[PDB]
Design a protein around this nucleic acid. Structure first.
Ligand SMILES: Nc1nc2c(ncn2[C@H]2C[C@H](O)[C@@H](COP(=O)(O)OP(=O)(O)OP(=O)(O)O)O2)c(=O)[nH]1
Ligand SMILES: [Mg+2]
Ligand SMILES: [Mg+2]
Length: 539
DNA sequence: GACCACGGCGCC
DNA sequence: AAACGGCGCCGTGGTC
């Protein structure tokens, strides 16, 4: 390419190099652009950012986030990664996409700019005539990238001092638990080493090894195994409590306070747009889609996620979302009727499982019921179901027939889904998002059946993900009109921040946008709450 | 210092 | 551990 002076013309493809992967923390090392047979290299990348009206190229969102961090409105536009990811969602990295579609991903801004240009041309070619994938690109993924850029750059407020206080308390309780474990063992050891624990539990003590680990065949020390031995000794009780406390302290309580950004005073995640096989987003650096909620200590941690002074958090979560989607996709009359009647399957299962009326079903019980319902749906064995529910085999198998006969057209949809997958090599969501599942005619049963469960899950989980992404695209402009912010997506949940004076209006509007995103054969319901912290906002 | 595989486990 | 699916990050253990 002809090396031309910097500024590039309108519509040029950008390339850029960051000191590290996180755009909120990265130094912009170099910036370049490519168009019309020329490459333009910026002499000083930060100043040169001002000359661009859009970020167009590989990893466009990342550059847009860094621009927003510097006070520039540089929205992300076309990204070949999103084209590639819609073609095949195993296209998750620029390294791979470049190799597959006509270049090499290097560490030079110029070459990344020229690569973005030629990869876009080629991938655009591949999507000609793929009208449904094009619709997804234009109406969901491309505009979603601009929304995510804003969410990333806004971040969330964290009660840092609260978590530092909590850390000191949790450390003392961990010491109490490990001290008791070491007494029961008769000696000290690394309780964080599952290899060392294995020896203690199954060799030194006499406890039965219930199961084996996948890759290396060691005797497992997982919670599922240890749950079976819960008063086979008092040491197991202590070990499980130790595991909870150490998991929460080392994953959330200690790391999160150190990730507060100096300019914003807030915690910033990355929403990864080409990371999953089903079309869900992911969150990393720090993952904010797996903040604790379930246990009392987990609830304490979640309370650290708070609103700006003068603002409130608004949390919105779709009701029973994949079951509603399944009703639409299968067209099962009975399941459609269940949601037209305003019934709640999770609560129904909880009430059944624990033998209490609906009014007595607590959050813990509801989460247990979710595992049963989705487990059963996505192909859990009778053998495992009988264990989970803690009842006989049959009762368990009868549960599976009671479930599937109640909704006869689900199985037919499953089988239809699998035959399309075997024939075309991929399955698809309602909107034509594809996942290639190659092993559906594998000659090994365990591998074939695993691929089957993957294949029929995706249209359901992926359609739910499509709905949420579309809702995000529609909602974002309405929020900024009202002076509200989108903070987090958690798969079927959104967390917004609103000025106190507008929070109730924001909640009502966001609820209606989410419910009417793309009407189905059943209604979508959204539970919404408002509060000073993330936990209080879902109560 | 980095990288990785693994078991394990937090959330959806 | 188990014929639920989708993720990312922890500490350990091993390597370069
Ligand atoms: N396969 C599988 N999918 C799950 C599981 N937990 C959650 N999901 C998926 C299916 C849910 O519809 C979706 C959103 O999770 P939620 O925790 O919000 O559950 P859901 O929306 O079903 O119920 P809700 O009314 O919000 O309590 O994520 C699980 O254990 N297995
Ligand atoms: Mg939900
Ligand atoms: Mg949810």
């Amino acid at each position: 390419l002809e090396e031309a002076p910097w500024p590039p013309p309108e519509g040029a493809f950008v390339g850029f190099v960051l000191s590290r992967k996180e755009p909120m923390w990265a130094d912009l090392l170099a910036l370049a652009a490519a168009r019309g047979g020329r490459v333009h290299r910026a002499p000083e990348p930060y100043k040169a950012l001002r000359d661009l009206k859009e970020a167009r190229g590989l990893l466009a969102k990342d550059l847009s986030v860094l621009a927003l961090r510097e006070g520039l409105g540089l929205p992300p536009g076309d990204d070949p990664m999103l084209l590639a990811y819609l073609l095949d969602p195993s296209n998750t990295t620029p390294e791979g996409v470049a190799r597959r579609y006509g270049g090499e991903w290097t560490e030079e801004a110029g070459e990344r700019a020229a690569l973005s240009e030629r990869l876009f041309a080629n991938l655009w070619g591949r999507l000609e005539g793929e009208e449904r994938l094009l619709w997804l690109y234009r109406e969901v993924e491309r505009p979603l990238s601009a929304v995510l850029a804003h969410m990333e750059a806004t971040g969330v407020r964290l009660d840092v001092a609260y978590l530092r206080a909590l850390s000191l308390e949790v450390a003392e309780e961990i010491a109490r638990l490990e001290a008791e474990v070491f007494r029961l063992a008769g000696h000290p050891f690394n309780l964080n080493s599952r290899d060392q624990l294995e020896r203690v539990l199954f060799d030194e003590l006499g406890l039965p090894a219930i199961g084996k680990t996948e890759k290396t065949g060691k005797r497992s020390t997982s919670a599922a195994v240890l749950e079976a031995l819960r008063e086979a000794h008092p040491i197991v009780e202590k070990i499980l409590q130790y595991r909870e406390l150490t998991k929460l302290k080392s994953t959330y309580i200690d790391p999160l306070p150190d990730l507060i950004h100096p300019r914003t005073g807030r915690l910033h995640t990355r929403f990864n747009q080409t990371a999953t096989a089903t079309g869900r987003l992911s969150s990393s650096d720090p993952n904010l889609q797996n903040i604790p909620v379930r246990t009392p200590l987990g609830q304490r941690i979640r309370r650290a996620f708070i609103a700006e002074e003068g603002w409130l958090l608004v949390a919105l979560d779709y009701s029973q979302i994949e079951l509603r989607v399944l009703a639409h996709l299968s067209g099962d009359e009975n399941l459609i009727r269940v949601f037209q009647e305003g019934r709640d399957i999770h609560t129904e299962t909880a009430s059944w499982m624990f033998g209490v009326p609906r009014e007595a079903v607590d959050p813990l019980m509801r989460r247990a019921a979710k595992t049963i319902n989705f487990g059963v749906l996505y192909g859990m064995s009778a053998h495992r179901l009988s264990q989970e529910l803690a009842i006989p085999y049959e009762e368990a198998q009868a549960f599976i027939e009671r479930y599937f006969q109640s909704f006869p057209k689900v199985r037919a949809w499953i089988e239809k889904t699998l035959e399309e997958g075997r024939r075309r090599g991929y399955v698809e969501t309602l909107f034509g998002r594809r996942r290639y599942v190659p092993d559906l005619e594998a000659r090994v049963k365990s591998v074939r059946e695993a691929a089957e469960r993957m294949a029929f899950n995706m249209p359901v989980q992926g359609t739910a993900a499509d709905l949420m992404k579309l809702a995000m695209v529609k909602l974002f402009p309405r929020l900024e009109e009202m002076g509200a912010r989108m903070l987090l997506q958690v798969h079927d949940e959104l967390v917004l921040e609103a000025p106190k004076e507008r929070a109730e209006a924001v909640a009502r509007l966001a609820k209606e946008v989410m419910e009417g995103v793309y009407p189905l054969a059943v209604p979508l319901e959204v539970e919404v709450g408002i509060g000073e912290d993330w936990l209080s906002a879902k109560e």
